Amino acid sequence: GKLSLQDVAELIRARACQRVVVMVGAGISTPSGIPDFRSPGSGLYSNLQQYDLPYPEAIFELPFFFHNPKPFFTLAKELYPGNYKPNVTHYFLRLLHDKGLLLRLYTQNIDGLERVSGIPASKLVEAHGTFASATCTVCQRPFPGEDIRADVMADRVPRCPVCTGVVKPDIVFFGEPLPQRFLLHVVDFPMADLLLILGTSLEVEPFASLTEAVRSSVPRLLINRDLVGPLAWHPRSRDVAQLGDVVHGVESLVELLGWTEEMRDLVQRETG
Ligand SMILES: CC(=O)O[C@@H]1[C@H](O)[C@@H](COP(=O)(O)OP(=O)(O)OC[C@H]2O[C@@H](n3cnc4c(N)ncnc43)[C@H](O)[C@@H]2O)O[C@@H]1O
Ligand SMILES: NC(=O)[C@H]1CCCc2c1[nH]c1ccc(Cl)cc21
Ligand SMILES: [Cl-]
Numbered sequence: 001g002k003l004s005l006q007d008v009a010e011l012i013r014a015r016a017c018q019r020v021v022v023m024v025g026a027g028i029s030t031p032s033g034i035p036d037f038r039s040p041g042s043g044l045y046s047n048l049q050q051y052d053l054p055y056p057e058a059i060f061e062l063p064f065f066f067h068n069p070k071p072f073f074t075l076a077k078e079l080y081p082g083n084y085k086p087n088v089t090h091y092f093l094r095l096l097h098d099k100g101l102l103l104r105l106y107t108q109n110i111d112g113l114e115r116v117s118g119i120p121a122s123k124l125v126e127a128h129g130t131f132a133s134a135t136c137t138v139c140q141r142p143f144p145g146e147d148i149r150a151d152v153m154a155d156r157v158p159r160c161p162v163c164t165g166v167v168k169p170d171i172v173f174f175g176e177p178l179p180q181r182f183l184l185h186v187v188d189f190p191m192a193d194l195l196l197i198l199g200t201s202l203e204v205e206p207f208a209s210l211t212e213a214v215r216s217s218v219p220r221l222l223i224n225r226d227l228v229g230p231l232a233w234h235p236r237s238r239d240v241a242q243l244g245d246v247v248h249g250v251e252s253l254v255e256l257l258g259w260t261e262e263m264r265d266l267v268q269r270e271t272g
């Protein structure tokens, strides 16, 4: 006795849902070639034995970064924007934006692929910050994101040209304050008429709890390998779970929306 994925498509087609709030995590970028955290076998938290860490979470903790920033920058050579491309998941969200349906996209990812896919900054809440800008950890001087990359790609720990203190990209490490734009969740979540949650385990707060901030009649559509978080534990009557690979699930929705040729055209134009 549940809504189907077709029911969600048909709400969108009818513009009965036209203020969509989306929440994403690391699962949406595995198809682009970036590991997630928690997937058995391939996740970061399963495969950081080599790094100089007390435990894997440490690489993304501000305290440990001060001790040794090397593991973080070693790893960020890779993760640094330029070398991965958005996938169909990202371009679907672009298409939602272009059709006037996207209220806001909240991302936990630092890969920057939402911006890469053409989502305007005003539509985006990068809840864990960005590599696009950087900041001295001693003097607070801001820097050209790009300038820091020069150093990172050439295997050097970025130091301030002024105080020589370590320059850190504007990423929210563990325990750190969320970015200023995160405050938009108070205007957004009550206004949302559909919530889409893609590729996240919903293990970390505040995202786990935002899924409960939408009004009780709002459908929640999960596209993800597993049923997770508040959707597993506190199901609501208009929840839909499309479980399986995220690209498959998005492609199923896109087909039900009638957008398949538009998405093919989009993707070919952008990346093909
Ligand atoms: C360091 C920090 O503060 O923040 C990071 C991160 O932003 C935060 C949230 O983790 P996040 O929820 O983003 O990542 P996780 O790695 O915790 O969750 C990824 C979710 O995506 C699913 N998944 C991965 N690939 C998939 C695929 N191809 N198709 C379908 N599902 C797939 C995977 O099963 C999991 O549920 O945990 C970490 O603590
Ligand atoms: N695809 C990603 O962006 C994921 C996987 C790459 C590392 C990463 C992600 N999300 C993060 C959130 C905070 C911090 Cl410090 C790191 C990450
Ligand atoms: Cl070895």
Ligand code: NA
Pocket: 052, 068
């Ligand atoms: Na050490």
Ligand SMILES: [Zn+2]
Pocket: 136, 137, 138, 139, 140, 141, 160, 161, 162, 163, 164, 165
């Ligand atoms: Zn400095």
